[PDB]
Symmetry: C4
Subunit: 288 residues, 4 copies
Amino acid sequence: TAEEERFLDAAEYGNIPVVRKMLEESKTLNVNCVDYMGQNALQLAVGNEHLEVTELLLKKENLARIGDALLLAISKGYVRIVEAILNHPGFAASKRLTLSFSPDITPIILAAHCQKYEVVHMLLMKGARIERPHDYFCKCGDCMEKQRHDSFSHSRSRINAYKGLASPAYLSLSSEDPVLTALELSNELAKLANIEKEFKNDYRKLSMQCKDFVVGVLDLCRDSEEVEAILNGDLESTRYQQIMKRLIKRYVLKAQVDKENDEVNEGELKEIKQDISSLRYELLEDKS
Amino acid sequence: TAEEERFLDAAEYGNIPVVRKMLEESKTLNVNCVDYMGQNALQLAVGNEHLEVTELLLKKENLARIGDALLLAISKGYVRIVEAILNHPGFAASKRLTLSFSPDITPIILAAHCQKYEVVHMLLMKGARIERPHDYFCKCGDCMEKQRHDSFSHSRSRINAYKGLASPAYLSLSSEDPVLTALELSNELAKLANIEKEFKNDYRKLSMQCKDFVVGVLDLCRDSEEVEAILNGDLESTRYQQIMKRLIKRYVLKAQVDKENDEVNEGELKEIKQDISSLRYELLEDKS
Amino acid sequence: TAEEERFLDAAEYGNIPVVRKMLEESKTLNVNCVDYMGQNALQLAVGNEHLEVTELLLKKENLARIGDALLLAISKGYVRIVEAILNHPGFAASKRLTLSFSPDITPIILAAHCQKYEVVHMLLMKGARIERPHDYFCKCGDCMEKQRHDSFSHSRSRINAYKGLASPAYLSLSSEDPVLTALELSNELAKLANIEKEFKNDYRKLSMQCKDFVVGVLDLCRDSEEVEAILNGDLESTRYQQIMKRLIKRYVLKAQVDKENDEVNEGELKEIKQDISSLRYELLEDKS
Amino acid sequence: TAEEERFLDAAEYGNIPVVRKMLEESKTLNVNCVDYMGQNALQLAVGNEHLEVTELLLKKENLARIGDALLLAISKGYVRIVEAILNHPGFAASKRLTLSFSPDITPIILAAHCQKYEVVHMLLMKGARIERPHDYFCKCGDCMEKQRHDSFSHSRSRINAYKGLASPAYLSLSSEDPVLTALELSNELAKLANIEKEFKNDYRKLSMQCKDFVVGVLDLCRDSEEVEAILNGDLESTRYQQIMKRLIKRYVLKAQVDKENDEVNEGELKEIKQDISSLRYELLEDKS
């Protein structure tokens, strides 16, 4: 395990030509090393180290921890690492159920809990769009889905799906008229707060998030739409497409500025330290 | 769009000799690439990457997004990027109305919402000084300006102009005796709070900002001016020039220290990461 | 002391080939320099400077400040510096009492006040596991330990030992079933709060920490264990091993994310500055 | 002023061989450039750029802004920049009054408002120790000092001197028994709060700071001194030297850790950016 420990020390920090040497030395030991994680690309997606990931993409020995590495790259919020994962090992489809951390969360939903717009838009450039809003009532038609599992996974996965479908970001993500759809989802979550018991506080939170979302989009304030359908929906609380897209861009830029006015995350500092160490290893080992 | 995507990947991060190669390869594809922004210098003014901007200044193919790039460089608060924008592509004048994001905000006003003194002073070294305090009453003389637009843009642009004219920074920016002018503007904003309805809280905020401004300038405390005109203005709440300029310098230095004792912005961390990546690309691609 | 001051200036910052020159110049002056600390590896374990420590490991001239340097590397929370200290100068055992800052704290306890899991796990890979929970009553059997010292060191070292034994991290550190042991320790600390006077607030704090620990481990929520022994312990407030280890890994990852969502420490910024200066000294002095 | 502006652009950022070229090109224009500051070493002591300062020390053309640059290096809290200022241009003495920003604050007092221990200790290694506690009553003996100036400078300079003499750091700085001297100064500031009117809140603050200082030094808790003189002083609220010095070292280390657990200053981030730009300029201009 000596070469394994050398590989992991080259893995947590940069050591990029050391990993090139581990490539060129006939791959004597497989990339299956365990510290606390079963595989090693999970600990390779820690810092902003793209070249390690590109060298991992040439290691197609069925290293089947690409999905959890993608979930780490989304939850930490990388961009080009997510692109390197999505492009080269290939993906046929991702619709219902495969056999590959690991919560029961599709990566569009996990990209929707965070509000990082470009990650979800890169997910939308590939074909996977809608998080499937079903009935989620006592009767749904998919009674066999209610009969496969009989546990708290139904209600909690329902709440997680509506947290994904809460539209924190869907105004850049739906096709046409996101405000009316946000009003409809607010009414639906209000009715679920009326009906579905013992979890009503979360539905009230999501309904107030949708309300304050619509209020902020109104507070963009370029040109008064003031459609009477919008007014009647408020009672229950083309060039038009061009005005709508311009307001979409305004709200996206304001949301990104309000993201950039936030408190520091310590992991973002750890990213800077690992980038400094990767610079150290690149410059010194290319001098040698 | 393959060269376009290579250009944008060279654009978000440093890749400065890659952009030199894109220059030297006959400019096969124009700099008009769209991710969410129409042009590309907007995404080039993200980090502290001056050499990209200087290479853009040699690209005079009527890439008409210099003004919004200047607004980004002011709102994020760069210094030498603003100098590179102001110097080389040339500016005839900027007084009332041209045809070139984009709120209805002149860059002196947007430099005045932020309190960054050196940016506004570099604006004042060129000829554009005053944000035009007009009557802003029911009657103003410029009734045709009130008749061109008939909307909320009058009142809201008025409030934005008085937020620019609130003097957060004008003590380094006016010509002579900024304290008496601040007292006069505080009296004017008090009278506008008395008269102009449904927005009185903002005028009260700006009046209290002017009052606390004058109180802090009094709290500099080198030599007691104590002019009886200042006393009579407080009732309604040369060597003198040398004392005034020295107090101006004292207040500017105290304001800059109080700026440097503020909470961290995450965009300032992103600037550090992009500077690290620019160092990476410079050193590695100059080794090659 | 001129070479001593040059050595200390090479010691606070990087200057790694300068320290190589101080090695190769026959070691004219010993590494015993005093600014405020008696030895110098204490001021060498400030930044993320591993090569200095590896050059110190070849300096085996009985520089007997390895233990306090290990305590600094644990309290600041380095990883590979702790590995470099533990591996090469050798350690026979660490059980009760040796003759080598310096509080009366064994490094497992000081690694247990901080919650850094990998440091304590690297301590557990070597043979030193348990922090010795004794009776700690009026009668204990070790009455001669109560008669060697007669001071406040008994009660305060007892409280420090139970702060080490509070299980902030022991769910990754004990062998089997940490939740039941946490319940037993919560009951023991509750009884010590009932009995041991004038320090009851700290025992109440540790008992509430154990309670909220067990509540969070319950709030992992994969599969309901719901053992009736757990229920009866709550009244006084194999595949099972596989489920338990998976919940252990879930709680460890959630704890590390909650660590990485914390406020910035200024010493972590100082680490970045000293790493930048080490890069400066490496690159410039290897150009020369 | 073209070479002046090139020099200032080399001055705000690193550009160290550019400043070497400005040295070697016969010094055509003197270092007297004005942006807002009269001299230029004030804007050269912004970042952690030592080589610029060492090149300034070879520029002995009576560039008489060394004292304000020293005050900037102390107030921002550099270490080796302060050493470079103190060592090479020479200092005869600094006792009462010379003719060379600029508040009326001696650098020991300005180093005492900040709590940076090593800066004040480097001041104490040179001969300047005591901030001269005089009577500061209605009668003092130095009545001519009260008759030279007749203004608020007496009371405010008195309060600033007692803020310097508040002992935030003097336990590492006085000769022997700092706790009894802190008790005496607390009694003196209490009596000044009884006597000197209209500023009593600041004296109450400094007295409570001295009280909490003594309480924290008591809360070090190695060995109970419990001198009856300390008890009688509390009523009005050798090996002993070795115990006292060890408690001094304990309190200094605890104070430095509590400094390193503080909120981030944005100027510390600006230091990192200017160090990155200095690395950029060094590496690129040494490639050329």
